[PDB]
Design an enzyme around this catalytic site. Structure first.
Site, PDB file in Angstrom:
ATOM      1  N   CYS A 108      93.162  40.812  16.798  1.00 22.47           N
ATOM      2  CA  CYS A 108      94.499  40.628  16.245  1.00 22.47           C
ATOM      3  C   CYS A 108      95.572  41.056  17.265  1.00 22.47           C
ATOM      4  CB  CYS A 108      94.670  41.490  14.968  1.00 22.47           C
ATOM      5  SG  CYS A 108      96.315  41.335  14.187  1.00 22.47           S
ATOM      6  N   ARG A 111      98.831  43.964  16.113  1.00 24.07           N
ATOM      7  CA  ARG A 111      98.555  45.292  15.611  1.00 24.07           C
ATOM      8  C   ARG A 111      99.636  46.376  15.915  1.00 24.07           C
ATOM      9  NH1 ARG A 111      93.089  46.499  18.285  1.00 24.07           N
ATOM     10  NH2 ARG A 111      93.372  44.543  19.504  1.00 24.07           N
ATOM     11  N   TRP A 280     102.412  37.716   9.267  1.00 24.47           N
ATOM     12  CA  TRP A 280     103.132  36.470   9.453  1.00 24.47           C
ATOM     13  C   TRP A 280     102.584  35.761  10.685  1.00 24.47           C
ATOM     14  CZ3 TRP A 280     105.574  41.302   9.420  1.00 24.47           C
ATOM     15  CH2 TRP A 280     105.763  41.882  10.686  1.00 24.47           C
ATOM     16  N   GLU A 285      99.530  29.455  16.485  1.00 25.28           N
ATOM     17  CA  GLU A 285      98.504  29.292  15.462  1.00 25.28           C
ATOM     18  C   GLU A 285      98.632  27.921  14.802  1.00 25.28           C
ATOM     19  OE1 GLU A 285      97.104  32.893  13.047  1.00 25.28           O
ATOM     20  OE2 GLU A 285      99.105  33.613  13.591  1.00 25.28           O
TER      21      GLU A 285
HETATM   22  C1  HEM Z   1     101.876  41.367  11.046  1.00 19.20           C
HETATM   23  C2  HEM Z   1     101.803  40.241  11.741  1.00 19.20           C
HETATM   24  C3  HEM Z   1     100.452  39.748  12.319  1.00 19.20           C
HETATM   25  C4  HEM Z   1     100.358  38.980  13.396  1.00 19.20           C
HETATM   26  C5  HEM Z   1     101.534  38.472  14.247  1.00 19.20           C
HETATM   27  C6  HEM Z   1      98.967  38.732  13.641  1.00 19.20           C
HETATM   28  C7  HEM Z   1      98.434  37.982  14.638  1.00 19.20           C
HETATM   29  C8  HEM Z   1      97.132  37.582  14.670  1.00 19.20           C
HETATM   30  C9  HEM Z   1      96.639  36.415  15.375  1.00 19.20           C
HETATM   31  C10 HEM Z   1      97.503  35.429  16.216  1.00 19.20           C
HETATM   32  C11 HEM Z   1      95.318  36.355  15.184  1.00 19.20           C
HETATM   33  C12 HEM Z   1      94.379  35.243  15.701  1.00 19.20           C
HETATM   34  C13 HEM Z   1      94.067  34.443  14.432  1.00 19.20           C
HETATM   35  C14 HEM Z   1      93.338  33.155  14.749  1.00 19.20           C
HETATM   36  O1  HEM Z   1      93.235  32.772  15.945  1.00 19.20           O
HETATM   37  O2  HEM Z   1      92.879  32.503  13.774  1.00 19.20           O
HETATM   38  C15 HEM Z   1      94.923  37.431  14.347  1.00 19.20           C
HETATM   39  C16 HEM Z   1      93.642  37.679  13.910  1.00 19.20           C
HETATM   40  C17 HEM Z   1      93.242  38.737  13.086  1.00 19.20           C
HETATM   41  N1  HEM Z   1      94.079  39.659  12.476  1.00 19.20           N
HETATM   42 FE1  HEM Z   1      96.156  39.586  12.574  1.00 19.20          FE
HETATM   43  N2  HEM Z   1      98.235  39.380  12.690  1.00 19.20           N
HETATM   44  C18 HEM Z   1      99.102  40.011  11.835  1.00 19.20           C
HETATM   45  C19 HEM Z   1      98.728  40.755  10.718  1.00 19.20           C
HETATM   46  C20 HEM Z   1      97.453  41.203  10.430  1.00 19.20           C
HETATM   47  C21 HEM Z   1      97.110  42.032   9.307  1.00 19.20           C
HETATM   48  C22 HEM Z   1      98.131  42.535   8.241  1.00 19.20           C
HETATM   49  C23 HEM Z   1      95.779  42.274   9.378  1.00 19.20           C
HETATM   50  C24 HEM Z   1      94.901  43.106   8.412  1.00 19.20           C
HETATM   51  C25 HEM Z   1      95.468  43.836   7.442  1.00 19.20           C
HETATM   52  C26 HEM Z   1      95.248  41.588  10.520  1.00 19.20           C
HETATM   53  C27 HEM Z   1      93.931  41.573  10.940  1.00 19.20           C
HETATM   54  C28 HEM Z   1      93.389  40.557  11.705  1.00 19.20           C
HETATM   55  C29 HEM Z   1      91.977  40.277  11.815  1.00 19.20           C
HETATM   56  C30 HEM Z   1      90.875  41.089  11.133  1.00 19.20           C
HETATM   57  C31 HEM Z   1      91.872  39.092  12.740  1.00 19.20           C
HETATM   58  C32 HEM Z   1      90.610  38.341  13.187  1.00 19.20           C
HETATM   59  C33 HEM Z   1      90.462  37.280  12.075  1.00 19.20           C
HETATM   60  C34 HEM Z   1      89.309  36.355  12.424  1.00 19.20           C
HETATM   61  O3  HEM Z   1      88.380  36.849  13.134  1.00 19.20           O
HETATM   62  O4  HEM Z   1      89.360  35.163  12.034  1.00 19.20           O
HETATM   63  N3  HEM Z   1      96.291  40.902  11.128  1.00 19.20           N
HETATM   64  N4  HEM Z   1      96.051  38.191  14.046  1.00 19.20           N
HETATM   65  N1  LIG Z   2      99.121  35.731  11.782  1.00 18.38           N
HETATM   66  C1  LIG Z   2      97.999  35.580  11.069  1.00 18.38           C
HETATM   67  N2  LIG Z   2      97.753  36.464  10.091  1.00 18.38           N
HETATM   68  O1  LIG Z   2      98.793  37.421   9.703  1.00 18.38           O
HETATM   69  N3  LIG Z   2      97.063  34.653  11.139  1.00 18.38           N
HETATM   70  C2  LIG Z   2      95.886  34.659  10.220  1.00 18.38           C
HETATM   71  C3  LIG Z   2      94.978  33.432  10.569  1.00 18.38           C
HETATM   72  C4  LIG Z   2      95.795  32.146  10.365  1.00 18.38           C
HETATM   73  C5  LIG Z   2      95.155  30.908  11.026  1.00 18.38           C
HETATM   74  N4  LIG Z   2      95.064  31.193  12.489  1.00 18.38           N
HETATM   75  C6  LIG Z   2      96.078  29.693  10.756  1.00 18.38           C
HETATM   76  O2  LIG Z   2      96.714  29.105  11.802  1.00 18.38           O
HETATM   77  O3  LIG Z   2      96.216  29.302   9.495  1.00 18.38           O
END
Ligand code: HEM
Ligand SMILES: N=C(NO)NCCC[C@H](N)C(=O)O
Ligand code: HEM
Ligand SMILES: C[C@H](O)[C@H](O)[C@H]1CNc2nc(N)[nH]c(=O)c2N1
Ligand SMILES: C[C@H](O)[C@H](O)[C@H]1CNc2nc(N)[nH]c(=O)c2N1
Ligand SMILES: N=C(NO)NCCC[C@H](N)C(=O)O
Ligand SMILES: [Zn+2]
Lengths: 411, 413
Positions: A108, A111, A280, A285
């Site tokens: 992520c 974070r 968000w 994405e």
């Molecule tokens: C607050 C704004 C956030 C942004 C800008 C953000 C951004 C991202 C992005 C760009 C990815 C890659 C997702 C993909 O390629 O499908 C990601 C993955 C991930 N994020 Fe976030 N995120 C946010 C919030 C959170 C929150 C609130 C959580 C947990 C409470 C979280 C946990 C994770 C996890 C566990 C992954 C890996 C998901 C997977 O393996 O498919 N993120 N995040």
């Molecule tokens: N920024 C976040 N989560 O907060 N992405 C969660 C996975 C979304 C997924 N990558 C999509 O484009 O639908």
């Protein structure tokens, strides 16, 4: 055993010690690096070391390590595992644990926000209707009229594994996909299978390009039920371009709330199989992946054509030009409707700052470079130039099997 | 170790099965608990050398369908005797060629490996002096350049003996531009080469102090102090960079050289160590247009280009950097193509790499690949490599990093 990471742009070197706290496997060995593979109940004996590992870190974090309060809790939990084979987290422990699963999420980029997470405790939920109610409240809270706020809603933990709560959806809000006789796919091809499960279960599909899917919710190991999120709770954004007036004619929209709902939250050995969370979007994405992946909406050709680029040769970079414009349109559209979105430059420089904070105050920050570097313009973002170490810390978000592969239907 | 490892492409759902990784021998920098996939940089004994020789010659003999033959067995005997008696051994010419081709075949960070079997090998093992090395290197450059129709080649200077008599090219590439730190802290030319440029100046190079000065060769033979040589300019093919629609692009004053020729790596074949082994192919445009031009710590032209495009530069969310990036890259591919100098775009290169990789899985049981390096530094997910899972492991013969020789050289004076 103490590891250095270098940023090759700034020459800054950080020293990682946090990796020694790492517990579970990475996928790799001394002979083979598996850095790019997407995917490489607990008995009493299993549970107590995990409970203890967690409580220790919890009590350390509130500066009461080795206190009577600390020792008192370990014993209480010990007694409870021995007597009931499981235990229950205090609300404080639950909140700390969820915030830390995010903190530890190697994939992520967002974070830096990790400690500002609204945690909704749904452990009193018993039915799928309850789950629907909970999820509507999450969606409305987090959406916040477009000023999005991070949240997670946590349903009851796994017990014997025959009474699992699950959200069958991969995200709370996604669009349907339909295999056509035309041979083609209408809508989002990532969701064909799930859409078909909905239909088998009773859903009346509109059969359009952007049908918000229904929730298929499973409480207490029962069969899953269908529910439609109130349309008025699903904020969507029409996609236009600030220069190309023809762009709106493509007929594209996306939703404002990305809410991963298929993962497992592990805290202190406890397994929360239904834990949908949201933050968000980062623009790429949607604009790069959701829109331009060949196995998604796959729109590059259509867009390139309307731009009248030279598509006879790859070396004109028509794909690259169109990609940038699609991504400009996404960001401009969300911004103009006042829906929170972050661009890939902003998000990656925030992440680098977070890494430096985490290195400074914690001794490291696990990061998966393959996932953190954005899918366009990689080397013009700072994270491309940053060495990162990937390892697994708990509490954690984990992948878990899709429930239809495993659910024993009652009928 | 598991006999079979699967890799999946998430675009196509094609699954491949790797067995080749079982012949991997050295380490990755990864452990059971840590993945160091994104980390850039993570003499031998008679005893150590016999088995390395043996493994290699079994591979060589197997590849020529003569495994187990008298010829095979005589050759093992001969090498064993040579090592016991002389402490090292010499490769036959056929073995050197096969060796060099395989170091390229096994190079997990090279996206161009569909080409691996088409490599011109120049045997410079009779070389004894730095003037001799200069002459070998001139010949390589003229052959490889070929008036713009680039031909892949490698020149192989004598192997390491006692580590006190090493042949080294001190240049990182045969052809590269000087960098000059100014007293105001700015850099003129290429910041990547500031250190080596200072060394050259110290050794006696008269620097033109411009923005695109071809550096002199600094060549060490037989462990002696390095000597300076000027590559004949008539031998250095360069391309002025223009854009097909923006007639102001040319007035940026940009150009680049046509021949990418990595000169600082070490080639290991059958345990032997070739510390001087310049090799060259041709450019993929992004190396120049993305990295060399647009990295902040290289030529860093993004602002100046965006300014001339009149992009909205007040907010990152305009994606102005992104927009200028694409135009610079169009310009590189257009300029090289217009001057008839071989170049490949990142779409064509990655498509070919995936075809190559599939073929290698079928005919060889594997293809070690480092995803971090194989995915291009712009437009990553619109190339098929992004969606391809890769296994990275080390096969020999190999190209390996070595420390910069100025960090280790014992100066004779
Ligand atoms: C607050 C704004 C956030 C942004 C800008 C953000 C951004 C991202 C992005 C760009 C990815 C890659 C997702 C993909 O390629 O499908 C990601 C993955 C991930 N994020 Fe976030 N995120 C946010 C919030 C959170 C929150 C609130 C959580 C947990 C409470 C979280 C946990 C994770 C996890 C566990 C992954 C890996 C998901 C997977 O393996 O498919 N993120 N995040
Ligand atoms: N920024 C976040 N989560 O907060 N992405 C969660 C996975 C979304 C997924 N990558 C999509 O484009 O639908
Ligand atoms: C023929 C056309 C070739 C193409 C298109 C090509 C492409 C590339 C590219 C784009 C890289 C990444 C370079 C960087 O990011 O700095 C690379 C790295 C590499 N290639 Fe090639 N290559 C070619 C020829 C060769 C040849 C002839 C050899 C050896 C005989 C070779 C061996 C290597 C090695 C060892 C690396 C890693 C370099 C490093 O780690 O700094 N390549 N290649
Ligand atoms: C095979 C490779 O792991 C795959 O294509 C990865 C690449 N990096 C990623 N990065 C992000 N953020 N999201 C992804 O889905 C992908 N997928
Ligand atoms: C830290 C990271 O490994 C580093 O910036 C890498 C990234 N991937 C790369 N990929 C290629 N092809 N060339 C490089 O120099 C880099 N550098
Ligand atoms: N394609 C090759 N060799 O054939 N690249 C070698 C490295 C060149 C280096 N990336 C540069 O941009 O100068
Ligand atoms: Zn690894």
């Amino acid at each position: 055993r103490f590891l250095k990471v270098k940023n090759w742009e700034t020459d800054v070197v950080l020293t990682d010690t946090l990796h020694l706290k790492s517990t579970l496997e990475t996928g790799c060995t001394e002979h083979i690096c598996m850095g790019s593979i997407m995917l490489p109940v607990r008995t009493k004996d299993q549970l107590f070391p995990l409970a203890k590992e967690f409580l220790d870190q919890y009590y350390s974090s509130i500066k009461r390590f080795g206190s009577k309060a600390h020792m008192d809790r370990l014993e209480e939990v010990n007694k409870e595992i021995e007597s009931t084979s499981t235990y229950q987290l205090k609300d404080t422990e639950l909140i700390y644990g969820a915030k830390h699963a995010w903190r530890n999420a190697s994939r992520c980029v967002g974070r830096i926000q990790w400690s500002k997470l609204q945690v909704f405790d749904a452990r009193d939920c018993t039915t799928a209707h309850g789950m629907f109610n909970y999820i509507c409240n999450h969606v409305k809270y987090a959406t916040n009229k477009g000023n999005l706020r991070s949240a997670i809603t946590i349903f009851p933990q796994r017990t014997d594994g025959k009474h699992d709560f699950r959200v069958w959806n991969s995200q709370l809000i996604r669009y349907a996909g339909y295999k056509q006789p035309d041979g083609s796919t209408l809508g989002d091809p990532a969701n064909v299978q799930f859409t078909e499960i909905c239909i088998q279960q009773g859903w009346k599909a509109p059969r359009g390009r952007f049908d918000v899917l229904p929730l298929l919710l499973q409480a207490n190991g029962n069969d899953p039920e269908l529910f439609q999120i109130p349309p008025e709770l699903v904020l969507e954004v029409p996609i236009r371009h600030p220069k190309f007036d023809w762009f709106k004619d493509l007929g594209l929209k996306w939703y404002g709330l990305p809410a991963v709902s298929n993962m497992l939250l592990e805290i202190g050995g406890l397994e929360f199989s239904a834990c949908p969370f949201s933050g968000w979007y980062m623009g790429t994405e949607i604009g790069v992946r959701d829109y331009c992946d060949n196995s998604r909406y796959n729109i590059l050709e259509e867009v390139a054509k309307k731009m009248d680029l030279d598509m006879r040769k790859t070396s004109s970079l028509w794909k690259d030009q169109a990609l940038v414009e699609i991504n400009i349109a996404v960001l401009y559209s969300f911004q103009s409707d006042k829906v929170t979105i972050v661009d890939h430059h902003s998000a990656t420089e925030s992440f680098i700052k977070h890494m430096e904070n985490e290195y400074r105050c914690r001794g490291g920050c696990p990061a998966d470079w393959v996932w953190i570097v954005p899918p366009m313009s990689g080397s013009i973002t700072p994270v491309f130039h940053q060495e990162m170490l990937n390892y697994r810390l708990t509490p954690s978000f984990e992948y878990q099997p899709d429930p239809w592969n495993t659910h024993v239907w009652k009928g």
